[PDB]
């Protein structure tokens, strides 16, 4: 019930929005962890899909940690919620997982754009800069990469061609 | 509704128990992540407590990943649940966090001992060996380290002595 | 008709079971040798299938040698039998050979699990540890690898697609 | 009269059995120290027998230290007893010392097997794993090495041939 | 029931004779494996006899593999038979094992000389050259080495002198 | 019942006194081993006290070995007795252990001074030189070091200040 000695120009609504973004980044980490181990199943067996999604999982945990750092740097207080189990699930094919990841990354981007419009509305240029520097271009690049992956799997003949997914695994994700 | 081609001597109850252990390891990862960022607050400011618990968080994620690998190696199917928010919370002091971590690691050890007694009861020597090789001695060492930490903080005069926690941070956790 | 000076807690039934396992490992070495040279035929011509199975042959001979060492370390006496010619034979395709190897490795694993249950029943913890340390996880990994191989050959369109087997040879077994 | 904060699944009988094993390892260290200096006498003068047994003495002290570490890791309390003087004594010849060492190592192994059966009976898989990992195979190898040494000294013509013991000293123990 | 596209000047009788030689080389590999582990027994304990025969075992497996390669290079088809258990057995002494190996290598040489006389009779100069280049001088050197070993063990006083076998182990086979 | 060929100017009383000193050095080794593992307890947890006393334990074993060497060099015969369990025990605090070690090292020094006065009385200048060269200054330095340690722990506020013992552990014994 006392103010942080560091807190300055950091609105309560921005603090709460950062806590929601921390949960979403941890959720995205968990989705990619689930997708990774789907491709490690003996009846799927696409090792470079598995490595690609595990690396994406580890990168989302780093995104979450940087937002936790941000909350403390500005004198807000971290508030954690349960990390929901992955809600795309029933992964089906390399193409379907890539399509789920594209939808996930577009939903994360929309959250970040809402967060930026809140920080704009509260005239918080430090938070705006943080989001722009560390999150917005990384999301645009992630979305473009996943779109490229979905396109090549479609053009190659996935998901009906198991040869398509096999060769994509070796040539793009190797 | 068809059996994995790799599955052999892997009981349904063992499969389900491994899924419960995966959740518990992810929960422990989340507890240590929360504890880490408590010590990064500007009104706590113990950077080596923060680094120690972040490293412990990263090690629990690795424990979880190895159990997910184990589930696929044996032809079981991973089933994920929500990762609950940390339930010790209200961290208070370096001593209180160390005491919460000791209780967490003893609860994880009791889960692993129950898992080993199930694998014994189902005559699954591969699973017994996996638990013994990768988990049981790591838990005994973690518990002994946390006990040692709690003892030194108590003897030094924590939690009343902020000088105790400061000097422990520099000398033990540096 | 006199006891070994080293023998201690080594039951006659365990001694005989180790001799049976030595034969089985030499049999598995011979199966993989036969499979290797099938892929070196001019009308098959898949050089990385041939190298993969030759390496597996050499690893089974090492498994057999380590059990012969074990028999002498415990003061048992090696008893050798004929090494039967390979009984899957008529190798047909890369997929069929991989399926034969998966069945072989599951039969070896079942032998090892029976051996472990005998050593358990005779309270021989050294033999139990030997089997767990040197054999059980190597069998789980071999079975998982062969399952993954069978899955990718099926998904790629083998055995009807000779292009599938050719490209698997280059990308997975290269 | 209060429980260790680390203690979990560690039976009082296991604690006491570990204390007895600590004494036995220190006793074995003392036997090999005595045997070492017998071979350094001017009327024995077999320098590589002396070095071999001194190294064995140093290895038994390390075994004892690791059990003392184990007792503290599990939250038991070390209880020390007198280390008895060596009870084979009157060393006589290189062959007789090797035969005394073989009997010592078989008695230590029987102690360890009793300790493992107690840990099994109390469902202590961590202690079972500790004994299997650090002690049982080291005892099997020690016993096999000593048997081999006794055999070669016998076949060479010891203890009547002082030339046998001299040449064994140079070629096997050099 | 169709001819290999590579087959040229390769008589059916030569093909069958190569298959018989493959079995004999695998048999010789198995004899030397059995002899190796006899010298690893605790009541024999001649480690350099054991290493010498294990290396000879590994060299006979290589001989067998090269004949399997030869069969495919010429467009013949490998036909495998059971590998008989060793038929000298009851190894007795280093001298007796060396005498068994000398007899084995003379029987292998007589097989190879019969194979060369068949290839001569069918005017197959490639097969004649293969046998001469890769097998005949290696057999003459093996036989001469084993004769030299038998001579030195006899002259030293084996098998009655266990000191002879011990010192041969160190000086010739070290 | 025959004299050593090397023995010269080595009185029976000196021989017996060296045997008593060997026991005392082994006793001192055992005291420091016990003290070491007291500081490794989870409810003590002073790792550099534990390392300091373990090193002191290892140095006393070396002292004992050098006296065993001395006994053989002079043609005396080693006579071993039981190594008594540590008789200070109930270690209490870093200060109390340091005070016990100071008393132990003063008792060892008094034994060595008695041994030197016996060697003087028997006109054994080699034994006098041995004691002076290898033992007397090492004892004076050990006693001075332990006194310095006791003084600093007292001045720092031990044993009531657990912070004193903690910081001494880091700064003096690190
Ligand atoms: Cl304000
Ligand atoms: Cl909030
Ligand atoms: Cl929640
Ligand atoms: Cl860019
Ligand atoms: Cl079943
Ligand atoms: Cl489940
Ligand atoms: Cl859930
Ligand atoms: Cl450890
Ligand atoms: Cl300080
Ligand atoms: Cl018996
Ligand atoms: Cl048998
Ligand atoms: Cl047979
Ligand atoms: Cl693994
Ligand atoms: Cl209890
Ligand atoms: Cl006790
Ligand atoms: Cl006692
Ligand atoms: Cl071994
Ligand atoms: Cl030499
Ligand atoms: Cl023709
Ligand atoms: Cl044939
Ligand atoms: Cl046959
Ligand atoms: Cl030549
Ligand atoms: Cl005299
Ligand atoms: Cl005496
Ligand atoms: Cl006594
Ligand atoms: Cl000095
Ligand atoms: Mg949300
Ligand atoms: Mg990414
Ligand atoms: Mg992200
Ligand atoms: Mg839900
Ligand atoms: Mg930028
Ligand atoms: Mg749970
Ligand atoms: Mg940890
Ligand atoms: Mg864990
Ligand atoms: Mg809740
Ligand atoms: Mg077990
Ligand atoms: Mg281990
Ligand atoms: Mg069989
Ligand atoms: Mg293999
Ligand atoms: Mg095998
Ligand atoms: Mg048959
Ligand atoms: Mg292992
Ligand atoms: Mg005892
Ligand atoms: Mg040893
Ligand atoms: Mg020992
Ligand atoms: Mg007595
Ligand atoms: Mg081991
Ligand atoms: Mg034949
Ligand atoms: Mg050869
Ligand atoms: Mg040959
Ligand atoms: Mg037969
Ligand atoms: Mg030539
Ligand atoms: Mg005394
Ligand atoms: Mg000292
Ligand atoms: Mg001393
Ligand atoms: Mg007493
Ligand atoms: Mg003087
Ligand atoms: Mg001096």
Task: Say if CB D78 and CB D19 are below 8 A apart.
Answer: yes
Task: Say if CB A68 and CB B57 are below 8 A apart.
Answer: no
Cβ contacts of E59 within 8 Å, gap of 6 or more: none
Nearest-angstrom CA–CA distance, B49 and B32: 11
Judged on CB neighbours under 10 Å (0-12, 13-18, 19+), C81 is middle
Largest CA distance in chain B: 62
> From the CB of residue F109, how many other CB atoms can be counted at a distance below 10 Å?
17
Determine, for residues C152 and A163 on separate chains, whether the beta-carbon distance falls below 8 Å: no
Please identify which residue in the block is written with the tokens 């680390």. D6
Task: Say if CB C94 and CB C66 are below 8 A apart.
Answer: no
3-state SS assignment for residue F45:
coil
CA angle, residues A86, A87, A88, in degrees to nearest 5: 100
Closest alpha carbon to B24 in B95, B115, B141: B115
Nearest-angstrom CA–CA distance, E10 and E72: 11
Determine, for residues E4 and C42 on separate chains, whether the beta-carbon distance falls below 8 Å: yes
Task: Say if CB D164 and CB D149 are below 8 A apart.
Answer: no
D120 contact residues in C (CB cutoff 8 A): 123, 125
Task: Say if CB B60 and CB B32 are below 8 A apart.
Answer: yes
Cβ contacts of E141 within 8 Å, gap of 6 or more: none
3-state SS assignment for residue A10:
coil
Task: Say if CB E153 and CB E28 are below 8 A apart.
Answer: no
Nearest-angstrom CA–CA distance, C85 and F30: 62
C-alpha distances (whole Å) from C143 to each of B113, C8, C100, C150 are: 27, 34, 11, 10
E41 contact residues in C (CB cutoff 8 A): 72, 77
* Ligand closest to CA B24: 32
The b-or-e profile of A43-79 (16+ CB within 10 A means b, else e) is: bbbbbbbbbbbbebbbebbebbbebbebbbebbbebe
Nearest-angstrom CA–CA distance, F159 and F64: 33
Q: Supply E112's token pair.
A: 């190879």
Q: Kindly identify which residue of chain F lies nearest to residue B147, measuring between CA atoms.
A: F42
Closest alpha carbon to A32 in A120, A100, A115: A100
- Write the DSSP string, E99-145: HHHHHHHHHHHHHHHHHHHHHHHTT-HHHHHHHIIIIIHHHHHHHHH
Task: Say if CB E22 and CB E71 are below 8 A apart.
Answer: yes
3-state SS assignment for residue C83:
strand
Closest alpha carbon to D84 in D26, D22, D19: D26
Cβ contacts of C121 within 8 Å, gap of 6 or more: none
Residues of D with CB under 8 A from a CB of C: 102, 106, 109-110, 113, 116-117, 120, 128, 131-133, 136-137, 139-141, 143-144, 147, 150-151
Q: Supply E125's token pair.
A: 């100069």
3-state SS assignment for residue D83:
strand
Cα A24 to ligand 27 centre (Å): 5
Nearest-angstrom CA–CA distance, F46 and E2: 82
As assigned by CATH, the class of the E3-174 domain is mainly alpha
Task: Say if CB F36 and CB F59 are below 8 A apart.
Answer: no
Alpha carbon A109 to chain centroid, angstroms: 8
Packing angle of the helix pair D162-171, D47-73 (nearest 10 deg): 60
Residue E138 annotated as binding site:
no
DSSP conformation class of A83: B
Q: Kindly identify which residue of chain A lies nearest to residue C168, measuring between CA atoms.
A: A166
Determine, for residues C82 and E78 on separate chains, whether the beta-carbon distance falls below 8 Å: no
3-state SS assignment for residue E83:
strand
Nearest-angstrom CA–CA distance, E108 and E104: 6
Please identify which residue in the block is written with the tokens 């007895």. D20
Virtual CA dihedral for C139, C140, C144, C149, nearest 10 degrees?
0
Closest alpha carbon to B18 in B58, B56, B75: B75
> From the CB of residue F82, how many other CB atoms can be counted at a distance below 10 Å?
14
CA atoms within 13 A on the CB side of F147: 8
CA angle, residues F131, F136, F140, in degrees to nearest 5: 170
Task: Say if CB D162 and CB D94 are below 8 A apart.
Answer: no
Closest alpha carbon to B38 in B84, B88, B82: B88
Hey, where are the domains in chain F? Answer: 3-174
Closest alpha carbon to F134 in F112, F114, F117, F118: F112
CA angle, residues A141, A146, A147, in degrees to nearest 5: 95
Task: Say if CB F46 and CB F39 are below 8 A apart.
Answer: yes
Determine, for residues D167 and E163 on separate chains, whether the beta-carbon distance falls below 8 Å: yes
Nearest-angstrom CA–CA distance, D92 and E89: 38
Task: Say if CB F162 and CB F153 are below 8 A apart.
Answer: no
The conformational region for residue D2 under phi > 0 = left, psi -120 to 50 = alpha, else beta, is beta
Q: Kindly identify which residue of chain F lies nearest to residue D71, measuring between CA atoms.
A: F41
Task: Say if CB D70 and CB B141 are below 8 A apart.
Answer: no
Of B102, B133, B141, the CB nearest to D5: B102
First-to-last alpha carbon distance for chain A, in angstroms, is 53
In this complex, whether B and A touch, counting 3 or more CB pairs under 8 angstroms, is yes
Task: Say if CB C97 and CB C49 are below 8 A apart.
Answer: yes
The b-or-e profile of F9-23 (16+ CB within 10 A means b, else e) is: ebbeebbebbbebbb
Binding site of B, by residue number, is 25, 60, 63, 105, 139
Of D106, D141, D151, the CB nearest to C8: D106
Task: Say if CB C72 and CB D144 are below 8 A apart.
Answer: yes
Residue of A50, A163, A164, A167 to mutate for C, most C C-beta atoms under 10 A: A163
Q: Which helix (H) or strand (E) holds A109?
A: helix A94-121
Cβ contacts of A117 within 8 Å, gap of 6 or more: none
Residue A60 annotated as binding site:
yes
CA angle, residues A122, A125, A129, in degrees to nearest 5: 130
Determine, for residues D147 and E44 on separate chains, whether the beta-carbon distance falls below 8 Å: no
Judged on CB neighbours under 10 Å (0-12, 13-18, 19+), F90 is exposed
Determine, for residues F43 and B152 on separate chains, whether the beta-carbon distance falls below 8 Å: no
The conformational region for residue C161 under phi > 0 = left, psi -120 to 50 = alpha, else beta, is beta
Neighbours of chain D (3+ CB pairs under 8 A): B, C, E, F
F163 contact residues in B (CB cutoff 8 A): 155-157, 161, 163-164, 167
Q: Kindly identify which residue of chain C lies nearest to residue A170, measuring between CA atoms.
A: C171
Q: Kindly identify which residue of chain D lies nearest to residue B146, measuring between CA atoms.
A: D6
DSSP conformation class of D89: -
Of A42, A167, A170, the CB nearest to C148: A42
Judged on CB neighbours under 10 Å (0-12, 13-18, 19+), E1 is exposed
C77 contact residues in E (CB cutoff 8 A): 41
Q: Supply D126's token pair.
A: 């961590």
CA angle, residues B114, B120, B124, in degrees to nearest 5: 120
Nearest-angstrom CA–CA distance, B40 and C114: 54
Shortest Cα–Cα distance, D6 to chain F (Å): 7
In this complex, whether B and E touch, counting 3 or more CB pairs under 8 angstroms, is no
Task: Say if CB C60 and CB C26 are below 8 A apart.
Answer: yes
Nearest-angstrom CA–CA distance, C123 and C129: 11
Q: Kindly identify which residue of chain E lies nearest to residue D140, measuring between CA atoms.
A: E42
The structure was resolved experimentally with: X-ray
């Amino acid at each position: 019930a006392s103010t942080s000695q560091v807190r300055q120009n950091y609105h309560q609504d921005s603090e709460a929005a950062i806590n929601r973004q921390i949960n979403l980044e941890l959720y995205a980490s968990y989705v990619y962890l689930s997708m990774s181990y789907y491709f490690d199943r003996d009846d799927v067996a696409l090792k470079n899909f598995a490595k690609y999604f595990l690396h994406q999982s580890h990168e989302e945990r780093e995104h979450a940690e940087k937002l936790m750092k941000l909350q403390n740097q500005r004198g807000g207080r971290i508030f954690l919620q349960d990390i929901k189990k992955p809600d795309c699930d029933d992964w089906e094919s390399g193409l379907n997982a890539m399509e789920c990841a594209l939808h996930l990354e577009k939903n994360v981007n929309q959250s970040l754009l809402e967060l930026h419009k809140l920080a704009t509305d509260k005239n918080d240029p430090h938070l705006c800069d943080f989001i722009e520097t560390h999150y917005l271009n990384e999301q645009v690049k992630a979305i473009k990469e996943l779109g490229d992956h979905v396109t090549n799997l479609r053009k190659m003949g996935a998901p009906e061609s198991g040869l398509a997914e096999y060769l994509f695994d070796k040539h793009t994700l190797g």
